[PDB]
């Protein structure tokens, strides 16, 4: 999809737009000897806030050179602390230190 | 018969951390990094005993 | 084409073989995230001269 700047500057307030963004991390590298292509990709519209707020993980792949790909995101430790049911019925994470 | 391990060998516990993808002459070879020397060997050939 | 080592060690002298060699200079580089393939390419026969 593409959002025209025209509609962005001319929609009534309360229209809910749906912008799309590429994560370029996993984009293929060009072959070393392949001729340059003409053209330049461009982006006119941008967020004012971080967009990937729901992101748990990213780039679950190996890189053949570096120990981990840049921008790779491990899951938070909290996703995996099963913790304990408490006597109340309240859930708890595991104690961080004894006592 | 259980063949004895030869004099030059180094004991090494298997671990998923030892093996990895790597560049080596334009191929994504399954490199093994020897825990003592730390050296990476992409090829099954030529690795330390 | 491929030249079997058998024929190389067993042809009568004066047989003219046709070996082929790859120039690997222009070989494509693998993608950075693509999984390693199993296998190892090998070459048994070599020249003694350029």
From Swiss-Prot, chain A:
Transmembrane segments: none annotated. It is found in: Virion. Coiled coil: none annotated. Homodecamer; each decamer is made up of two conformers of VP2, called VP2A and VP2B. 12 homodecamers assemble to form an icosahedral capsid. Inner capsid protein that self-assembles to form an icosahedral capsid with a T=2 symmetry, which consists of 120 copies of VP2, with channels at each of its five-fold vertices. This capsid constitutes the innermost concentric layer of the viral mature particle. Belongs to the turreted BTV-fold inner capsid family. This is Inner capsid protein VP1. It comes from Bombyx mori cytoplasmic polyhedrosis virus. The lineage of its organism: Viruses, Riboviria, Orthornavirae, Duplornaviricota, Resentoviricetes. The chain holds residues 1186 to 1284 of 1333 of the full protein.
């Amino acid at each position: 999809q593409h959002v025209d700047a025209e509609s962005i500057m001319t929609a009534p307030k309360g229209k809910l737009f749906h912008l799309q963004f590429m994560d370029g991390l996993l984009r293929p590298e060009p072959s070393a000897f392949d001729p340059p292509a003409s053209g330049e990709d461009m982006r006119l519209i941008y967020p004012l806030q971080p967009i990937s707020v729901a992101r748990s993980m990213r780039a679950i792949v190996n890189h053949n050179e570096v120990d981990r790909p840049r921008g790779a995101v491990a899951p938070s430790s909290y996703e995996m602390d099963t913790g304990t049911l408490s006597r109340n019925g309240d859930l708890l994470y595991s104690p961080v230190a004894n006592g | 018969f259980v063949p004895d391990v030869p004099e030059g060998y180094v004991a090494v516990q298997y671990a998923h951390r030892l093996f990895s993808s790597s560049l080596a002459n334009k191929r994504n070879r399954v490199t093994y990094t020897h825990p003592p020397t730390g050296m990476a060997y992409p090829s099954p050939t030529g690795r330390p005993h």
